[PDB]
């Protein structure tokens, strides 16, 4: 029985955990991923890596997942485990409206799947969710917000970040365009297409390729969409008119 | 060199290395003497100390009235086993009344410490016991193994050095049997002193002695109740 | 509650009322109780209105699972079998009263199956609260080896009578036949009560109603 | 790559690079190790089961050594392998048998038990805890609306209707012998089903044995009763076919 | 008596890759080929039932299996693996019956389906499916087609091929494939790309076909399937 | 790699060896057993001059009437003397009466080799304790001292030295003890033998005096009247 | 309700009534108290409608299982024993009254008895239900030892026909089985073919 | 015929040959145990195990290899005496369970496939090892008659007129061969089962031996009872006249 074990929850000699850093190696062949934060609003993009003449389409995204009334998430990893922390997501949302009959701080849904991610790395003797997630929402506390989280049960705020393929060139790329406080959601999906089409392995870009959803207070509520392909097409053209007019 | 490690691995000669491994335990420790009459039995038992400002170790332990047993392995499995003896000793006293017989109470540990032998992650009791018992069919000498097998005997000695003791009763096994209180124990003793050394004899801290039959209970004599015992003793034979 | 069930030549026709109570006042005058099991199988439903319901849709849902492993029609014996050791299993806490009636490929089949879980085997029977007039119908007129229409007319007779003479059962009369290759469910086989047309209506006119606060909410 | 092995992928039932399971395709040979070959012919009257019957030495009574095994009295089986996993398969198809008539009803159907097996036999395959069985099972019984009906299950889960089958060390062998037989038509009635069963056991080992050395057991129409013919009926049978 | 290992067998390697999922992969590739296509009118899964013995019965096991009255499956790879995770689909679909009192949305249904399937991949002493699975159904006057493979992941498709030479069949199903098709059109394309990697002449016991419309699921009879095969419709 | 409860070819567990090689890594610590009393000395090892002196207790009270000193492993420690602690209330709350420092021993004694993978609770034990402890306390029988180990063999002592210097104090406790003597001179010979094992020089806030005797309770020595007994050097 | 067994040299006459009553209403005049559990073996149901059909198909499949494991044709004590163990284990959740008889090879004929308590007795002839009451009197005076097949056949007739009579739950109709080695040979005795009896009028 | 590294390791793993080695290796256990002899007669069953004396110590009837499953049953053991206890607790309990449901004793025949399929359950796993002793059973009524069960650690049953388990099984049956069971009564069996023993028993490899043996037929009514001193000692003198 012990000669067939794997041994998962197991401390190297250096003081590090193997399956939680081979984990973090899977998340760094899948599609490229970022979501920055602005003052008007909050917004996810993320590169589509279901590719194909013959795709049906009929969801509503392939990466962004609705948790919330407020909130939404965006995925890098494996996309059948990512399913199940999404649909966990949905329930401790759901639980906290149940018992306290107000939408959940985006604070509080983030370390509360991070708990669940934190015990399979401890204790259980099995393989941790190999999904990075970003997650985009708005409370009454602090306002428009953007989290990451690791496969190890570590999260992280941010205001601008990325995750996945070529993802420490792209998060070097939005420490040099950003603007704190100062940022505005045009400017936001301005710089958002700006870094996915640098940092990628078939550049040119195109509609189908990539997927942004945006996040908006309007008339007191809260306004989750995803930006169909003719919206996409025109931000990618003033982007593509902005590579002509820089040979000046 | 593979097969060493679990119960459950059986050899390709066709044995078991854990369970002969634990019987190394009962090797290591000091050795016990075990013999019966027509109407007693005697158990003789060595101390040991691991310092000489350190008292000597508990050698008999008490199981019942008319059961009582002397240990030689693992301290901890001694009393685990020992707890066990003594639970269905009262079980027995509480819905028959009557004392259990030591037949049936051997048997009930050549079941209990089978289950282990046979699952994997359990290890065998690294123990060897001998049982010193009487009931409604007379004096009994009981010796148990790491293994389930028990072994009902006349006279036995398990230990360390244990073998020249075993010579000498073999010699004196057709005596016991019309043997008198006072020299059944003597018999005992002299046997006890085969497993020493020459250059050691018995004394008052390092012997105890456990006494059961039809005239008395199960008693242990220590330091100063095993004098009575030791006085009047044959010269060392070297 | 009148629920009847009867075997003649060809098949089985199976007989309900429409009228559901809370207490003694009704509350649904257009109720199913004839409930589907299979394709070939339905079951007429008394007693508890919800305990009914959802006993036949779990044995409906399970027959569906065991029809598809086997591959051919399920039979009625298995219908019956599940229904017999469920409610048995519950002491009669769920009061469920069914009338079984299906056609096999051994032949057609007539269970009558009690909350407690007791099951009869028999060409006619009737259950519910108006069951005892149902069943005098069947004792004066049944005979065995009838016609479709004439055994119809027997069953919606017999339902009929529960209807005028039981305060519990009233309103339309819904008929199952199902034989070796047709299945008619006619839904208003008889209508025998109607309800006097208001002649003298009391339309409240537009603005009669006192308002204290309005509030409007457009939608997409 | 053809025959690569990654990790313990040979030890528990888990996948090879390739994407085969070893352990699974062992229990086939373990089939083999008993050194007995059972051949099952189906007719449009009756199927028919026939098996060597090893008897090494005197000392063994003859009528306890059977493979021959009654499920239903309507249905029967044959086992070939490891007699230990042979029998314990018979206990829980005679369980399943059982369960089948007390839950549905009516009488378990041979398509329905040879699946229920199968399924069971699943559980060997993607579970690590335990081995698959070493063992072949050959059902036959009459359905009471298609007829006679012959199937078999594999310790890997694969189960199959059949019009002829076998299975052991001469399984290969025995196999392309019944194809040309069935590729020819042949007016298959009771003493022809029987004849053709047992000459295909004689004729792939070689041996033209006595009525002591098989066991046939068979299933008519007239009869669905499962009934084993015994070396008084096989006897009459084995007569017959030194004739032409 | 028996306990059951609690540690995982599918684990993460060094390069990053699940070394289980990859090899169940490997499984499903070298399986019998098995083509899905919608058509916007209805849905047609065809199949190869090679029995490459004659001795074995051909109408007795069926690889085309219904889960409801409007929902069916077709696979590739490994044959036992597959009819547990018919059993399970059909138990799901009955679930959501008894909850909701509406048959279940195929979109729904592949995703308990495959949420099985994941598990298996993460679940103490289990390896994965070698299965990957076609699902077809009708709901809301709008057919569907899915894709679960082994890792637990599902793909909505308009047309796809599985098993042997996978890539040789959406190639040529890229090349003759079109929307707006026929159901009767639909039929007639899809056991032409079942030709494309076959051997050994159609016989209508050698491939399985199974329909899907408003009308419902069904397996279309041996009788239906001689009609479509003779070189001609 | 092999399982935790694995006899060795010598005749013992391997858990269970290791465990006493913990021991040697850990503190030194002196019990003597007096006609009048019995006196416990621990060292505190002070690694850094602004770690609290006062904060480092190895010598426990279970009972009014019974201390414990500890050598090894002090995590590993608390939980067994924790453990001691409830038994002698669990015994005083049933029979109305102070448990004999034998038996509180052996009840901590029990817990000994308690620890096992397969066929064991949730939340039980995988390794056995490495820790050396010293029962030292007065009943009816008089002062009595107690030794135990990781193995859970326990034994009556006059004089005992557990720790890393265990091999050097105890030949050094050979030559001084003897049955007659006094409690001031137990308490003078332990400190005498404790400056010969350690490395830093004996201070005031630097070990931990602690004596049991029959007229008084367990009695903890402070600073003040620790150097009544320290200015005899 | 009224069943009977009666033992003779060949195996055993067995009968039972046809009347189930939900209080005073008669649900079902054509009930068959004779279950069949295997070749030879029958049982005669009284008391609880559900409680005594579920434990029937419950030995059935209990000794249905038993008799292939064996490989050997099944006693009516074992049988009976299979009755026993659930009439008795829950004595205070069934209400039961089943008198077991049938044919084995290695015994015969045989009548068990087992009551609402959840005993098991052998006896020549056995009387249960709510009518067996006012037939006691009859079957005691009558009876005479070692009757043959077809004066069982009556003696079992003559007395249902007199329980009904005077018990209300009990009526309808006679069903009576006869088993030996040949088989299960049942008859069903009719309106005019009831055992007549006299009504004593001024 | 003999893996190192792996298949060998395991009871739930199988060998690329398609064997269980785990098993086999527990059927080698048994092998290096002393001989252990059962032959049916016309009357009843007899049976007898040489007990192989390690130390002079030992009391005459300590480590019996005889014991009493049912009133009517015996069982003979061979190989660990430390399984053997074991499955002999299995076997009463099983034969006192049937009592309790049935209410009469056990058959044999089902005794013996109840307790094999309990050995069996041994050798799947890698949780539990296969029990490492074979063992035999014998009952003798007025229906049944005379009947003799073999059970061996893989979890086979088989009827036998005469069986032999232990050291030297092949010269064990090979004298049995010899011997008419089938006409002879249980008395001549006793007198003949002796010498059987003594002519198989190394006594250059191993030391001395104790005789043990058991009636089971209709000289003791039907109860399996333990030999008399008389018949004994008469079956052990012509045991050492016709060894000269």
């Given at each position: 029985?012990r000669?067939?074990?794997?041994?998962?929850?197991?401390?190297?000699?250096?003081?590090?955990?193997?399956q939680?850093?081979?984990?973090?190696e899977?998340?760094?062949?899948?599609?490229?991923c970022?979501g920055?934060?602005?003052?008007?609003?909050?917004?996810?993009?993320?590169?589509?890596?279901?590719?194909?003449?013959?795709?049906?389409?009929?969801?509503?995204?392939?990466?962004?997942?609705?948790?919330?009334?407020?909130?939404?998430?965006?995925?890098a990893?494996?996309?059948?485990?990512?399913?199940?922390?999404?649909?966990?997501?949905?329930?401790?949302?759901?639980?906290?409206?149940?018992?306290?009959?107000?939408?959940?701080?985006?604070?509080?849904?983030?370390?509360?799947?991070?708990?669940?991610?934190?015990?399979?790395?401890?204790?259980?003797?099995?393989?941790?969710?190999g999904?990075?997630?970003?997650?985009?929402?708005?409370?009454?506390?602090?306002g428009?917000?953007?989290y990451?989280?690791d496969?190890?049960?570590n999260?992280?705020?941010?205001?601008?970040?990325?995750?996945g393929?070529?993802?420490?060139?792209?998060?070097?790329?939005?420490?040099?365009?950003?603007?704190?406080?100062?940022?505005?959601?045009?400017?936001?999906?301005?710089?958002?297409?700006?870094?996915?089409?640098?940092?990628?392995?078939?550049?040119?870009?195109?509609?189908?390729?990539?997927?942004?959803?945006?996040?908006?207070?309007?008339?007191?509520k809260?306004?989750?969409?995803?930006?169909?392909?003719?919206?996409?097409?025109?931000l990618?053209?003033?982007?593509?008119?902005?590579?002509?007019?820089?040979?000046? | 060199?593979?097969?060493?490690?679990?119960?459950?691995?059986?050899?390709?000669?066709?044995?078991?290395?854990?369970?002969?491994?634990?019987?190394?335990?009962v090797?290591q420790?000091?050795?016990?003497?075990?013999?019966?009459?027509?109407?007693?039995?005697?158990?003789?038992?060595?101390?040991?100390?691991?310092?000489?400002l350190?008292?000597?170790?508990?050698?008999?332990?008490?199981?019942?009235?008319?059961?009582?047993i002397?240990?030689?392995?693992?301290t901890?499995?001694?009393?685990?086993?020992?707890?066990?003896?003594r639970?269905?000793?009262?079980?027995?006293r509480?819905?028959?009344?009557?004392?259990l017989?030591?037949?049936?109470?051997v048997?009930?540990?050549?079941?209990?410490?089978?289950?282990?032998?046979q699952?994997?992650?359990?290890?065998?009791?690294?123990?060897?016991?001998?049982?010193?018992?009487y009931?409604?069919?007379?004096?009994?000498?009981?010796?148990?193994?790491?293994?389930a097998?028990?072994?009902?005997?006349?006279?036995?000695?398990?230990?360390?050095?244990?073998?020249?003791?075993?010579?000498?009763?073999?010699?004196?096994?057709?005596?016991?049997?019309?043997?008198?209180?006072?020299?059944?124990?003597?018999?005992?003793?002299?046997?006890?002193?085969?497993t020493?050394?020459?250059?050691?004899?018995?004394?008052?801290?390092?012997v105890?002695?456990?006494?059961?039959g039809?005239?008395?209970?199960?008693?242990?004599?220590?330091?100063?109740?095993?004098?009575?015992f030791?006085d009047?003793?044959?010269?060392?034979?070297? | 509650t009148?629920?009847?069930?009867?075997?003649?030549?060809?098949?089985?026709?199976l007989?309900?009322?429409?009228?559901?109570?809370?207490?003694?006042?009704?509350?649904?005058?257009?109720?199913?109780?004839?409930?589907?099991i299979?394709?070939?199988?339905?079951?007429?439903?008394?007693?508890?209105?919800?305990?009914?319901?959802?006993?036949?849709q779990?044995?409906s849902?399970?027959l569906?699972?065991?029809?598809?492993?086997?591959?051919?029609?399920?039979?009625?014996?298995?219908?019956?079998?599940?229904?017999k050791?469920?409610?048995?299993?519950?002491?009669?806490?769920?009061?469920?009263?069914?009338?079984?009636?299906?056609?096999?490929?051994?032949?057609?089949?007539?269970?009558?199956?009690?909350?407690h879980?007791?099951?009869?085997?028999?060409?006619?029977?009737?259950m519910?609260?108006?069951?005892?007039?149902?069943?005098?119908?069947f004792?004066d007129?049944?005979r065995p080896?009838?016609?479709?229409?004439?055994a119809?007319k027997?069953?919606?007779?017999?339902?009929?009578?529960?209807?005028?003479?039981?305060?519990?059962?009233?309103?339309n009369?819904?008929?199952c036949?199902?034989?070796?290759?047709?299945?008619?469910?006619?839904?208003?086989?008889?209508?025998?009560?109607?309800?006097?047309?208001?002649?003298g209506?009391?339309?409240?006119?537009?603005?009669?109603?006192?308002?204290?606060?309005?509030?409007?909410?457009?939608?997409? | 790559?053809?025959g690569?092995?990654?990790?313990?992928?040979?030890?528990?039932?888990?996948?090879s690079?390739?994407?085969?399971?070893?352990?699974?395709?062992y229990?086939?040979?373990?089939?083999?190790?008993?050194?007995?070959?059972?051949?099952?012919?189906?007719?449009?009257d009756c199927?028919?089961?026939?098996?060597?019957?090893?008897?090494?030495?005197?000392?063994?009574?003859?009528?306890?050594?059977?493979?021959?095994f009654?499920?239903?009295?309507?249905?029967?089986?044959?086992?070939?392998?490891?007699?230990?996993?042979?029998?314990?398969?018979?206990?829980?198809?005679?369980?399943?048998?059982?369960?089948?008539?007390?839950?549905?009803?009516?009488?378990?159907?041979?398509?329905?038990?040879?699946?229920?097996?199968?399924?069971?036999?699943?559980?060997?395959?993607?579970?690590?805890?335990?081995?698959?069985?070493?063992?072949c099972?050959?059902?036959?019984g009459?359905?009471?609306?298609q007829?006679?009906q012959?199937?078999?299950?594999?310790?890997?889960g694969?189960?199959?209707?059949?019009?002829?089958?076998?299975?052991?060390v001469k399984?290969?062998?025995?196999?392309?012998?019944?194809?040309?037989?069935?590729?020819?038509?042949?007016?298959?009635?009771?003493?022809?089903?029987?004849?053709?069963?047992?000459?295909?056991?004689?004729?792939?080992?070689?041996?033209?044995?006595?009525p002591?050395?098989?066991?046939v057991?068979?299933?008519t129409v007239?009869?669905?009763?499962?009934?084993?013919?015994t070396?008084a009926e096989?006897?009459?049978?084995?007569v017959?076919?030194?004739e032409? | 008596?028996?306990r059951?290992?609690?540690?995982?067998?599918?684990?993460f390697?060094?390069?990053?890759?699940?070394?289980?999922?990859?090899?169940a992969?490997?499984?499903?590739?070298?399986?019998?080929?098995?083509?899905?296509?919608?058509?916007?009118?209805?849905?047609?899964?065809?199949?190869?039932?090679?029995?490459?013995?004659?001795?074995?019965?051909?109408?007795?096991?069926?690889k085309?299996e219904?889960?409801?009255?409007?929902?069916?499956?077709?696979?590739?790879?490994?044959?036992?693996?597959?009819r547990?995770?018919?059993?399970?689909?059909?138990?799901?679909?009955?679930?959501?019956?008894l909850?909701?009192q509406?048959?279940?949305?195929?979109?729904?249904?592949?995703?308990?389906?495959?949420?099985?399937?994941?598990?298996?991949?993460?679940?103490?002493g289990?390896?994965?499916?070698?299965?990957?699975?076609?699902?077809?159904?009708w709901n809301?006057?709008?057919?569907?087609?899915?894709?679960?493979?082994?890792?637990?992941?599902?793909?909505?498709?308009?047309?796809?091929?599985?098993?042997?030479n996978?890539?040789?069949?959406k190639?040529?199903?890229?090349?003759?494939?079109n929307?707006?098709?026929?159901?009767?059109?639909?039929?007639?394309?899809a056991?032409?790309?079942?030709?494309?990697?076959?051997?050994?002449?159609?016989?209508?016991?050698?491939?399985?076909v199974?329909?899907?419309?408003?009308?419902?699921?069904?397996?279309?009879?041996?009788?239906?399937?001689?009609?479509?095969?003779?070189?001609?419709? | 790699?092999?399982?935790?409860?694995?006899?060795?070819?010598?005749?013992?567990?391997?858990?269970?060896?290791?465990?006493?090689?913990?021991i040697?890594?850990?503190?030194?610590?002196?019990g003597?057993?007096?006609?009048?009393?019995?006196?416990?000395?621990?060292?505190?090892?002070?690694?850094?001059?602004?770690?609290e002196?006062?904060?480092?207790?190895?010598?426990?009270?279970?009972?009014?009437?019974?201390?414990?000193?500890?050598?090894?492993?002090?995590?590993?420690?608390?939980?067994?003397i924790?453990?001691?602690?409830?038994?002698?209330?669990?015994?005083?709350?049933?029979?109305?009466?102070?448990?004999?420092?034998?038996?509180?021993?052996?009840?901590?004694?029990?817990?000994?080799l308690?620890?096992?993978?397969e066929?064991?609770?949730?939340?039980?034990?995988?390794?056995?304790?490495?820790?050396?402890?010293?029962?030292?306390?007065v009943?009816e029988?008089?002062?009595?001292?107690?030794?135990?180990?990781?193995?859970?063999?326990?034994?009556?002592?006059?004089?005992?030295?557990?720790?890393?210097?265990?091999?050097?104090?105890?030949?050094?406790?050979?030559?001084?003890?003897?049955?007659?003597?006094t409690?001031?001179?137990?308490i003078?010979?332990?400190?005498?033998?404790?400056?010969?094992?350690?490395?830093?020089?004996?201070?005031?806030?630097?070990?931990?005096?602690?004596?049991?005797?029959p007229?008084?309770?367990?009695?903890?020595?402070?600073?003040?009247?620790?150097?009544e007994?320290?200015?005899?050097? | 309700?009224?069943?009977?067994?009666?033992?003779?040299?060949?195996?055993?006459?067995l009968?039972?009534?046809?009347?189930?009553?939900?209080?005073?209403?008669?649900?079902?005049?054509?009930?068959?108290k004779?279950?069949?559990?295997?070749?030879?073996?029958?049982?005669?149901?009284?008391?609880?409608?559900?409680?005594?059909?579920?434990?029937?198909?419950?030995?059935?499949?209990?000794l249905?299982?038993?008799?292939?494991?064996?490989?050997?044709?099944?006693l009516?004590?074992?049988?009976?024993?299979?009755f026993?163990?659930?009439?008795?284990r829950?004595?205070?959740d069934?209400?039961?009254?089943?008198?077991?008889?049938?044919?084995?090879?290695?015994?015969?004929?045989?009548?068990?008895?087992?009551?609402?308590?959840?005993?098991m007795?052998?006896?020549?002839?056995?009387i249960?239900?709510?009518?067996?009451?006012?037939?006691?009197?009859?079957?005691?005076?009558?009876?005479?030892?070692?009757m043959?097949?077809?004066?069982?056949?009556?003696?079992?007739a003559n007395?249902?026909?007199?329980a009904?009579?005077?018990?209300g739950?009990?009526?309808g109709?006679?069903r009576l089985?006869?088993?030996?080695?040949?088989?299960?040979?049942?008859?069903?005795?009719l309106?005019?073919?009831?055992?007549?009896?006299?009504?004593?009028?001024? | 015929?003999?893996?190192?590294?792996?298949?060998?390791?395991?009871?739930?793993?199988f060998?690329?040959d398609?064997?269980?080695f785990?098993v086999?290796?527990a059927?080698?256990?048994?092998?290096?145990?002393?001989?252990?002899?059962?032959?049916?007669?016309?009357?009843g069953?007899?049976?007898?195990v040489?007990?192989?004396?390690?130390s002079?110590?030992y009391?005459?009837?300590?480590?019996?290899?005889?014991?009493?499953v049912?009133?009517?049953?015996?069982?003979?053991?061979?190989?660990?005496?430390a399984?053997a206890?074991?499955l002999?607790?299995?076997?009463?309990?099983?034969?006192?369970?049937?009592?309790?449901?049935?209410?009469?004793?056990?058959?044999?025949?089902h005794?013996?496939?109840?307790?094999?399929?309990?050995?069996?359950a041994?050798?799947?796993?890698?949780?539990?090892?296969?029990?490492?002793?074979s063992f035999?059973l014998?009952?003798?009524?007025?229906?049944?008659?005379?009947?003799?069960?073999?059970?061996?650690?893989?979890?086979?049953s088989?009827?036998?007129?005469?069986?032999?388990?232990?050291?030297?099984?092949?010269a064990?049956?090979?004298?049995?061969?010899?011997?008419?069971?089938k006409?002879?009564?249980?008395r001549?069996?006793?007198?003949?089962?002796?010498?059987?023993?003594?002519?198989?028993?190394?006594?250059?490899?191993?030391?001395?031996?104790?005789?043990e043996?058991?009636?089971?037929?209709?000289?003791?009514?039907?109860?399996?009872?333990?030999?008399?001193?008389?018949?004994?000692?008469?079956?052990?003198?012509?045991?050492?006249?016709?060894?000269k």
């Amino acid at each position: 029985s012990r000669r067939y074990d794997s041994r998962t929850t197991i401390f190297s000699p250096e003081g590090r955990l193997y399956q939680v850093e081979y984990a973090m190696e899977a998340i760094g062949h899948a599609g490229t991923c970022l979501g920055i934060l602005a003052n008007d609003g909050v917004l996810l993009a993320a590169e589509r890596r279901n590719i194909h003449k013959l795709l049906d389409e009929v969801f509503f995204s392939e990466k962004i997942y609705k948790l919330n009334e407020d909130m939404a998430c965006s995925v890098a990893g494996i996309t059948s485990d990512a399913n199940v922390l999404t649909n966990e997501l949905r329930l401790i949302a759901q639980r906290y409206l149940l018992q306290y009959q107000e939408p959940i701080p985006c604070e509080q849904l983030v370390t509360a799947l991070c708990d669940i991610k934190q015990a399979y790395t401890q204790f259980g003797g099995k393989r941790p969710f190999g999904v990075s997630l970003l997650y985009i929402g708005w409370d009454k506390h602090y306002g428009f917000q953007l989290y990451q989280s690791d496969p190890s049960g570590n999260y992280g705020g941010w205001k601008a970040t990325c995750i996945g393929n070529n993802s420490a060139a792209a998060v070097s790329m939005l420490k040099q365009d950003y603007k704190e406080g100062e940022m505005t959601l045009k400017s936001a999906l301005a710089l958002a297409v700006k870094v996915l089409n640098k940092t990628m392995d078939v550049s040119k870009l195109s509609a189908e390729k990539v997927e942004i959803a945006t996040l908006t207070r309007e008339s007191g509520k809260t306004v989750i969409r995803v930006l169909k392909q003719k919206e996409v097409e025109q931000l990618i053209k003033k982007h593509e008119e902005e590579e002509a007019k820089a040979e000046r | 060199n593979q097969y060493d490690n679990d119960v459950t691995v059986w050899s390709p000669q066709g044995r078991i290395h854990q369970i002969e491994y634990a019987m190394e335990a009962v090797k290591q420790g000091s050795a016990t003497v075990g013999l019966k009459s027509k109407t007693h039995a005697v158990l003789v038992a060595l101390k040991r100390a691991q310092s000489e400002l350190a008292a000597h170790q508990k050698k008999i332990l008490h199981v019942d009235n008319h059961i009582g047993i002397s240990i030689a392995g693992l301290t901890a499995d001694a009393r685990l086993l020992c707890n066990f003896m003594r639970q269905e000793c009262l079980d027995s006293r509480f819905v028959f009344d009557r004392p259990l017989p030591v037949s049936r109470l051997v048997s009930l540990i050549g079941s209990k410490t089978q289950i282990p032998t046979q699952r994997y992650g359990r290890r065998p009791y690294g123990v060897g016991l001998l049982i010193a018992g009487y009931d409604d069919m007379g004096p009994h000498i009981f010796q148990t193994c790491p293994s389930a097998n028990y072994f009902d005997c006349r006279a036995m000695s398990i230990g360390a050095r244990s073998q020249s003791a075993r010579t000498y009763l073999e010699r004196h096994m057709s005596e016991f049997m019309e043997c008198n209180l006072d020299e059944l124990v003597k018999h005992g003793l002299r046997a006890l002193r085969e497993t020493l050394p020459a250059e050691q004899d018995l004394t008052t801290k390092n012997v105890s002695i456990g006494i059961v039959g039809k005239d008395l209970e199960f008693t242990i004599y220590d330091d100063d109740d095993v004098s009575p015992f030791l006085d009047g003793l044959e010269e060392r034979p070297q | 509650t009148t629920i009847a069930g009867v075997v003649y030549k060809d098949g089985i026709v199976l007989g309900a009322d429409t009228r559901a109570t809370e207490g003694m006042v009704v509350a649904d005058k257009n109720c199913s109780k004839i409930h589907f099991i299979s394709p070939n199988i339905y079951c007429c439903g008394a007693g508890t209105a919800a305990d009914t319901d959802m006993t036949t849709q779990l044995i409906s849902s399970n027959l569906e699972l065991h029809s598809l492993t086997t591959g051919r029609l399920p039979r009625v014996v298995t219908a019956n079998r599940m229904l017999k050791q469920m409610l048995f299993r519950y002491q009669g806490y769920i009061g469920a009263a069914l009338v079984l009636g299906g056609v096999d490929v051994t032949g057609p089949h007539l269970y009558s199956i009690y909350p407690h879980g007791s099951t009869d085997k028999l060409p006619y029977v009737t259950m519910g609260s108006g069951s005892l007039a149902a069943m005098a119908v069947f004792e004066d007129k049944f005979r065995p080896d009838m016609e479709e229409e004439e055994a119809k007319k027997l069953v919606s007779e017999a339902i009929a009578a529960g209807i005028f003479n039981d305060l519990g059962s009233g309103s339309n009369i819904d008929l199952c036949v199902i034989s070796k290759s047709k299945l008619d469910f006619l839904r208003p086989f008889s209508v025998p009560n109607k309800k006097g047309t208001r002649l003298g209506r009391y339309r409240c006119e537009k603005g009669t109603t006192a308002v204290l606060t309005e509030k409007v909410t457009p939608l997409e | 790559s053809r025959g690569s092995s990654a990790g313990f992928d040979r030890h528990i039932t888990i996948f090879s690079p390739e994407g085969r399971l070893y352990q699974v395709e062992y229990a086939f040979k373990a089939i083999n190790q008993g050194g007995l070959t059972s051949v099952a012919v189906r007719g449009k009257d009756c199927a028919v089961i026939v098996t060597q019957k090893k008897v090494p030495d005197k000392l063994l009574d003859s009528s306890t050594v059977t493979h021959l095994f009654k499920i239903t009295e309507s249905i029967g089986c044959v086992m070939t392998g490891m007699t230990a996993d042979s029998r314990s398969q018979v206990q829980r198809a005679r369980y399943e048998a059982a369960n089948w008539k007390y839950k549905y009803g009516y009488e378990i159907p041979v398509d329905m038990l040879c699946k229920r097996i199968a399924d069971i036999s699943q559980v060997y395959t993607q579970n690590a805890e335990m081995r698959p069985l070493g063992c072949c099972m050959i059902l036959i019984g009459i359905d009471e609306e298609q007829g006679p009906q012959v199937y078999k299950c594999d310790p890997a889960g694969y189960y199959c209707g059949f019009k002829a089958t076998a299975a052991g060390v001469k399984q290969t062998e025995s196999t392309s012998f019944l194809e040309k037989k069935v590729k020819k038509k042949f007016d298959w009635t009771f003493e022809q089903t029987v004849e053709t069963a047992i000459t295909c056991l004689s004729t792939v080992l070689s041996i033209d044995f006595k009525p002591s050395e098989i066991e046939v057991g068979v299933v008519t129409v007239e009869n669905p009763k499962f009934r084993i013919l015994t070396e008084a009926e096989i006897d009459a049978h084995l007569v017959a076919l030194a004739e032409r | 008596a028996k306990r059951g290992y609690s540690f995982s067998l599918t684990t993460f390697s060094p390069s990053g890759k699940l070394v289980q999922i990859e090899y169940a992969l490997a499984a499903v590739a070298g399986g019998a080929p098995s083509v899905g296509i919608k058509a916007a009118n209805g849905v047609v899964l065809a199949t190869e039932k090679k029995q490459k013995s004659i001795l074995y019965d051909e109408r007795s096991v069926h690889k085309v299996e219904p889960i409801t009255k409007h929902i069916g499956l077709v696979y590739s790879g490994m044959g036992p693996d597959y009819r547990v995770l018919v059993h399970r689909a059909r138990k799901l679909a009955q679930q959501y019956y008894l909850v909701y009192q509406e048959p279940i949305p195929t979109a729904q249904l592949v995703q308990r389906v495959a949420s099985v399937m994941q598990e298996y991949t993460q679940s103490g002493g289990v390896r994965p499916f070698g299965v990957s699975l076609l699902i077809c159904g009708w709901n809301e006057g709008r057919p569907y087609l899915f894709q679960s493979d082994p890792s637990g992941a599902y793909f909505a498709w308009k047309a796809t091929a599985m098993g042997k030479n996978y890539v040789n069949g959406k190639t040529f199903l890229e090349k003759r494939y079109n929307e707006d098709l026929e159901l009767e059109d639909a039929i007639h394309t899809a056991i032409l790309t079942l030709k494309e990697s076959f051997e050994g002449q159609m016989t209508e016991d050698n491939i399985e076909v199974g329909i899907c419309n408003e009308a419902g699921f069904r397996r279309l009879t041996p009788t239906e399937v001689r009609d479509y095969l003779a070189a001609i419709a | 790699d092999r399982g935790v409860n694995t006899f060795s070819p010598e005749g013992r567990l391997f858990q269970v060896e290791y465990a006493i090689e913990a021991i040697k890594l850990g503190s030194t610590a002196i019990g003597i057993q007096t006609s009048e009393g019995v006196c416990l000395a621990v060292e505190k090892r002070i690694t850094s001059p602004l770690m609290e002196p006062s904060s480092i207790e190895k010598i426990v009270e279970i009972d009014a009437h019974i201390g414990c000193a500890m050598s090894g492993l002090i995590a590993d420690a608390k939980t067994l003397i924790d453990k001691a602690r409830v038994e002698t209330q669990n015994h005083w709350f049933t029979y109305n009466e102070t448990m004999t420092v034998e038996s509180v021993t052996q009840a901590v004694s029990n817990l000994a080799l308690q620890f096992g993978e397969e066929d064991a609770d949730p939340g039980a034990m995988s390794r056995p304790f490495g820790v050396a402890l010293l029962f030292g306390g007065v009943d009816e029988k008089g002062p009595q001292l107690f030794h135990m180990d990781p193995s859970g063999t326990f034994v009556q002592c006059d004089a005992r030295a557990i720790g890393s210097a265990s091999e050097g104090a105890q030949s050094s406790l050979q030559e001084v003890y003897h049955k007659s003597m006094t409690l001031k001179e137990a308490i003078k010979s332990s400190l005498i033998i404790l400056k010969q094992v350690m490395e830093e020089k004996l201070n005031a806030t630097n070990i931990e005096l602690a004596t049991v005797q029959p007229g008084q309770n367990f009695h903890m020595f402070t600073k003040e009247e620790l150097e009544e007994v320290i200015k005899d050097i | 309700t009224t069943i009977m067994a009666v033992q003779f040299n060949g195996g055993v006459v067995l009968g039972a009534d046809s009347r189930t009553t939900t209080g005073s209403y008669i649900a079902n005049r054509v009930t068959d108290k004779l279950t069949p559990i295997h070749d030879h073996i029958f049982c005669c149901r009284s008391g609880s409608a559900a409680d005594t059909q579920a434990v029937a198909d419950a030995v059935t499949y209990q000794l249905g299982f038993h008799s292939i494991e064996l490989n050997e044709p099944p006693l009516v004590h074992t049988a009976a024993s299979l009755f026993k163990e659930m009439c008795y284990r829950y004595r205070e959740d069934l209400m039961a009254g089943i008198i077991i008889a049938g044919w084995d090879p290695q015994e015969g004929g045989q009548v068990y008895s087992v009551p609402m308590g959840g005993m098991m007795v052998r006896q020549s002839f056995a009387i249960g239900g709510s009518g067996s009451s006012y037939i006691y009197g009859y079957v005691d005076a009558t009876y005479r030892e070692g009757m043959t097949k077809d004066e069982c056949l009556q003696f079992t007739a003559n007395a249902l026909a007199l329980a009904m009579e005077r018990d209300g739950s009990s009526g309808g109709v006679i069903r009576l089985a006869a088993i030996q080695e040949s088989g299960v040979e049942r008859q069903v005795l009719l309106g005019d073919q009831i055992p007549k009896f006299t009504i004593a009028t001024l | 015929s003999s893996i190192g590294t792996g298949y060998d390791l395991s009871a739930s793993t199988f060998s690329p040959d398609g064997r269980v080695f785990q098993v086999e290796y527990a059927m080698k256990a048994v092998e290096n145990s002393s001989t252990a002899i059962g032959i049916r007669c016309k009357d009843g069953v007899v049976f007898g195990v040489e007990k192989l004396v390690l130390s002079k110590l030992y009391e005459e009837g300590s480590n019996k290899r005889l014991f009493n499953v049912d009133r009517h049953v015996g069982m003979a053991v061979a190989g660990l005496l430390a399984d053997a206890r074991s499955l002999a607790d299995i076997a009463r309990e099983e034969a006192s369970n049937f009592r309790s449901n049935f209410g009469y004793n056990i058959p044999l025949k089902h005794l013996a496939d109840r307790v094999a399929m309990y050995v069996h359950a041994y050798t799947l796993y890698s949780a539990v090892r296969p029990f490492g002793c074979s063992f035999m059973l014998g009952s003798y009524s007025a229906n049944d008659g005379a009947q003799l069960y073999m059970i061996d650690p893989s979890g086979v049953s088989y009827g036998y007129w005469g069986c032999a388990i232990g050291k030297a099984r092949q010269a064990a049956k090979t004298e049995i061969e010899k011997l008419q069971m089938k006409e002879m009564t249980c008395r001549d069996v006793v007198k003949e089962v002796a010498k059987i023993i003594y002519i198989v028993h190394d006594e250059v490899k191993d030391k001395a031996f104790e005789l043990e043996l058991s009636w089971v037929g209709e000289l003791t009514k039907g109860r399996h009872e333990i030999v008399p001193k008389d018949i004994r000692e008469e079956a052990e003198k012509y045991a050492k006249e016709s060894l000269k």
